[model samples]
Target chain A: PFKPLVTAGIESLLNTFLYRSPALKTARSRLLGKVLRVEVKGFSTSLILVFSERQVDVLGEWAGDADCTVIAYASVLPKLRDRQQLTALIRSGELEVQGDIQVVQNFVALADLA
Target chain B: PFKPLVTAGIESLLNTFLYRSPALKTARSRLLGKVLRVEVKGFSTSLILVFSERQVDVLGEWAGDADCTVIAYASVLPKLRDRQQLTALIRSGELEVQGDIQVVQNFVALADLAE
Candidate 1:
């Protein structure tokens, strides 16, 4: 298992990028209510990101219940699935998400991401 | 723009996880002799990762000339896509890569990345 610092560093990278992105920069950012659950292979731990009405939760791994869901396998999400393909695949049924279909429209913005 | 320290920290995070992954634990790792290029928005600089026969190159962003390349926008590769989804997306043509395609086969082990 990797250290918590490792996770922090990774989360920091993502958080920094998200906040810096114009689409995500707002007092009421679209993702404010978003929640993500990331599962990786071979590792016992899973990642959770929660964006509450208050502050954006950079890391929170709650499995019981979540608002909007982002499910990704640890094996596939990293180092591959560039920007263009990630969203397209999700639209084309390559990736699976088991929550609010309407949220998918906003979720697609993450593709134009950079 | 994020600081270089942020990049170093990110590389450290990825390298730490990649080396720690069991699939990548090998004397002659399959990823050797590979190079990757990453492009992100809001920043002009691109990232490159190179792996040599001797030592694995954790971070090397050389735009001039490179071998196998992995093209991911800074905005896309960071957080949203998960492991299973990312790979499938690439296969499904959701992502864009320009270079020796064969290299992608071995290049994907980075997804087992843990924290």
Candidate 2:
């Protein structure tokens, strides 16, 4: 339901946060040829992020399948900015992540790394 | 971090959904003066939803004290529209709710009533 501008805004936020954080980029760089689907609960849209060495792309639409599917409320993102509770959010039972268990491990790794 | 208009938008959405749901409204009516804090994780803001008998108000900002605090990702809101999984979301461990065991009970009651 995002207008073009709003969608762009979301993209900008993602790029700024992901690329700006060396820790996140470093963790992402570890994954090769992996696909992750992020279902934004509030927005009613899914973003498929494809990970290649050193970079990730948000597919225009759901890519049908993914190695992992992360379900979260959009509000979770801003909360991460606090950085004080990164570990808590993952383990606190507030976020739902499914799909390949191995992929979940990598995600857990990403959070640990950050 | 929301602009005034965007914050207003969020308020409008809450009002529309909560007021529109007879079950939610009835539940609100049961709590004469209960205060609930809604922390929208993605939005990085907390809204205090104060219940006053027949209605609830999303206070303009955090009200410092609350009887209950419901922590959730903003994405969770639209997902609730499915109505197929209101109970699931609450029981599904994807939402973090704290404070006042009785308040949580009332929330669970609301969901069950919706069913």
Candidate 3:
């Protein structure tokens, strides 16, 4: 029952920050049409972010394959704001990434806009 | 840090459903410029729904006053989908409402459009 609410809330939040600035256009273009799946360790549900030409579409589920996936603990999510730390975080076992690493990098670049 | 994400998610979710059907236009118009404050028991943050001509803007905080306020338990929220039960629920102390009751009714009327 609350799934809809939870998903919708996250979707709006991400999109709000994603489009807040024009300087991130390069990052957004790189991410267009790509899907980024975020799985928070210890959580049953994951968030699928589909990058569209205009905005990111956030969903609770997506049947198609994702371009990239990031699995990390909830506490580690905030650290993602720094794209430079991504490689270090993964090497340290604090985060796990799969698929196109460039997609993850582009996502992290957009994070600075938030 | 997470608050912005939470508020934006809800805002989009609500606006998505709110505009999905043209049948809700009347209900939307009725709610235009109205402020609805929702306080879920046991939660520190409250959701403030600000109705505009185009869509409902959801926010985690609002400096202005709300035209209506609903305070209830998290479980009681789903029951609000059934506006008919509103009075009965309030009578039983399962829910509490303040300010313009019509705002709540109009809001409930729009809930049916959600998938």
Winning candidate number (TM-score): 3
lDDT of each residue in B6-55, candidate 3, tens digit only: 56766766777786578778778888889999997866568899998777
Span of 10 residues, lowest total lDDT, candidate 2 chain A: A1-10
Taken over the whole model, the C-alpha lDDT of each candidate is 0.53, 0.60, 0.81
RMSD of each: 15.3, 16.3, 5.1
lDDT of 2 by residue, B1-115 (tens): 3443444454444444444466576665665577777778887877676666544555546536788887789888545443345557778876676887466456445544544
Model 1: number of clashes? Answer: 13
Docking class of 2: incorrect
Error of 3 at A73 (Å): 2.8
lDDT for each residue of candidate 1 in B1-115, tens digit (9 for 90 to 100): 4454556465655555565556555522666766766554346566666665433433324546666555555656654224565566577654666777555545554443333
lDDT for B104 (candidate 1): 52
Residue ranges of candidate 3 with Cα displaced over 4 Å: B1-6, B9-55, B60-105, B108-115
DockQ of 3: 0.43
Candidate 1 lDDT at B82 equals 48
For each candidate in turn, the TM-score is 0.41, 0.38, 0.64
List the candidate numbers ranked by DockQ, top first.
3, 1, 2
